[PDB]
């Protein structure tokens, strides 16, 4: 039940594939190809997910899998 295993499911959701899915090392930019419209209801929902105000900084490690779960881990800091 790591921080990310809670991210991943979201994550790999708001695309449409498994938690397994979801890799590491990916990028739901490319690896994946999630759309503006994909790459919001993520963020949207990710942030409703835990109840937290991504904020425009915290905006930058967000474009595939592990960076989610990395915010949703410890967020950066």
Same mark, same amino acid.
Request: hydrophobic share 40%; glycine share 6%.
């Given at each position: 039940? @790591?921080? $990310? ?14 938690? =397994? &899915? ?6 739901f ?9 994909? @790459?919001? $209801? ?14 425009? =900084? &915290? ?13 949703i ?5």
């Amino acid at each position: 039940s @790591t921080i $990310e295993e809670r991210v991943k499911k979201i994550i790999g959701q708001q695309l449409g594939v498994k938690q =397994e &899915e979801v890799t590491n090392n990916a990028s739901f930019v490319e690896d994946l190809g999630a759309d503006s419209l994909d @790459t919001v $209801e993520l963020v949207m929902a990710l942030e409703e997910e835990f109840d937290t105000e991504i904020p425009d =900084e &915290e905006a930058e490690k967000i474009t595939t899998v592990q960076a989610a779960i990395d915010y949703i881990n410890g967020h950066q800091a």
